[PDB]
Amino acid sequence: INLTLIGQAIAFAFFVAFCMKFVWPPLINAISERQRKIADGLNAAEKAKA
Amino acid sequence: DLADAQAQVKQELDAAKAQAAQLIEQANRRAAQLIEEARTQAAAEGERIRQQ
């Protein structure tokens, strides 16, 4: 179509924003499942303790 | 169950120690009884020798 560099300018700018600005709430999210696995391994060790 | 485990461990150790007390107290008491009985036997035997 037409170049209309305005579109690509806004696309890159708002992309970099909407990604870096909100990488962090995702980075929060990785931990919950991992620690759930921690719980489900420790409850596995408890029976050996028995 | 992990919490239950240590309670059962202690409830076994204390019972084992009670068994320790009871049987070790019984043994030496029986030994003293045997000593007294042997002394009585010797008392009976010596006077028999003297009467003979």
Curated annotation (Swiss-Prot), chain A:
TM stretches of this protein: 3-23
Localization in the cell: Cell inner membrane
Complex formation: F-type ATPases have 2 components, F(1) - the catalytic core - and F(0) - the membrane proton channel. F(1) has five subunits: alpha(3), beta(3), gamma(1), delta(1), epsilon(1). F(0) has three main subunits: a(1), b(2) and c(10-14). The alpha and beta chains form an alternating ring which encloses part of the gamma chain. F(1) is attached to F(0) by a central stalk formed by the gamma and epsilon chains, while a peripheral stalk is formed by the delta and b chains.
Family: Belongs to the ATPase B chain family.
Function of the protein: F(1)F(0) ATP synthase produces ATP from ADP in the presence of a proton or sodium gradient. F-type ATPases consist of two structural domains, F(1) containing the extramembraneous catalytic core and F(0) containing the membrane proton channel, linked together by a central stalk and a peripheral stalk. During catalysis, ATP synthesis in the catalytic domain of F(1) is coupled via a rotary mechanism of the central stalk subunits to proton translocation. Component of the F(0) channel, it forms part of the peripheral stalk, linking F(1) to F(0).
Protein name, as recorded: ATP synthase subunit b
Organism: Acinetobacter baumannii (strain ATCC 17978 / DSM 105126 / CIP 53.77 / LMG 1025 / NCDC KC755 / 5377)
Underlying gene: atpF
Residues of the full protein shown: 3 to 52 of 156
